[PDB]
Design a protein around this ligand. Structure first.
Ligand SMILES: CCN(CC)c1ccc2c(C)cc(=O)oc2c1
Lengths: 215, 215
């Protein structure tokens, strides 16, 4: 066997250049092709470089593979660093008797801008009420940093039972989303004037309110 | 070029045997070697099978690769399941320079009883409609294992554009929750007779449907 050795983590601001190295422990780096893979948390990996320095279509030209024979290493160079480049990066080569991966490098993009959540509150449907259940959901999307706290109200009073809120996950736009859901009986839903979801993010609060409908 | 289609998830209890398939869409499965990679969450991938059925040294013989020409598929069979086997598994092959990866399969080693998700589908809120948005939300709660796939339809046509699904989150009852949201325009929403959210979990595909109205 041989090993591919990568730094554990690198941290840089947007717009800068980052270099991630991949040093072969034994045998020459050039005796087999080196691939690079990018993996965002929550997603499968993608190929960003194959055959040392070839870029698949759709991969931005900011990504460049190279080989340095004197340091017995391969490098992935990302110029013009963007928020979307925050990921784990893995180099990969062959032992002939095996496919071998580097240990992975976490690339942190520092200084991502703050983004307030979009908050949308949905009442229980007819169909759900007809099945003798009542759930409210408060959708909280497109926010950064990825921490919120949620409070529910029945009329103006705090609800302290039947609340769950999901752990925030980064979505395809590189911001977080979550939902808070409140489980009620149909009778609870109908015996109040309204329910409200109040979302606090970075010290600012957003409130939405829904009421039982009338035809 | 061809696709390698894996099931999204499999599960079994410790000590049991599990099988993961990898079906090639076009061409002949045996025309090129198949690799299988194991990736535990937040870790580097490792090769468990190369060249259809060769096991690297250090990989237990619990792991076995096979090829079925009749179904044009490769399988990974894991016997004597252990809790450290819980990971995403990917098959991989090629035609010429085109390297093809499967989508990945989550293997859960059951840590608690299976639980079928509650699936609740919400049409757009009144407040967001009077703001040029129409979001649908499919709430998926109380499920174990914490692996689901979600698919949306407009009338009968598959819809991929505008879909985001959160990473399943372990809630206070020790079961998972997530939400899938489909971001439409109001005119998109009105231009169909219905939308459907299909949720696949542990061998079943459940479905909820919603239709526009005024009240
Ligand atoms: C980093 C290597 N691995 C196995 C974990 C993977 C897994 C899946 C893919 C897919 C789907 C496309 C790809 O280009 O590279 C991958 C690479």
């Amino acid at each position: 066997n041989f090993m591919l050795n990568q730094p554990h983590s690198v941290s840089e601001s947007p717009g800068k250049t980052v270099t991630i190295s991949c040093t072969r422990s034994s045998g020459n780096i050039d005796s087999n092709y080196v691939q690079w893979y990018q993996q965002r948390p929550g997603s499968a990996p993608i190929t960003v470089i194959y055959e040392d320095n070839q870029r698949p279509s759709g991969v931005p030209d900011r990504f460049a593979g190279s080989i340095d024979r004197s340091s017995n290493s391969a490098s992935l160079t990302i110029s013009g660093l963007k928020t979307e480049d925050e990921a784990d990066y893995y180099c990969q080569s062959y032992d002939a008797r095996n496919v071998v991966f580097g240990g992975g490098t976490r690339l942190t993009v520092l200084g991502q801008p703050k983004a307030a959540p979009s908050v949308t509150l949905f009442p229980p449907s007819s169909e759900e009420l007809q099945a003798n259940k009542a759930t409210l959901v408060c959708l909280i999307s497109d926010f950064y940093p990825g921490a919120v706290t949620v409070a529910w109200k029945a009329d103006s009073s705090p609800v302290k039972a039947g609340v769950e809120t999901t752990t925030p996950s980064k979505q395809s736009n590189n911001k977080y989303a979550a939902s808070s859901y409140l489980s009620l009986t149909p009778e609870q839903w109908k015996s109040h004037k309204s329910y409200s979801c109040q979302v606090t993010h970075e010290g600012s609060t957003v409130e939405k309110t829904v009421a039982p409908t009338e035809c």
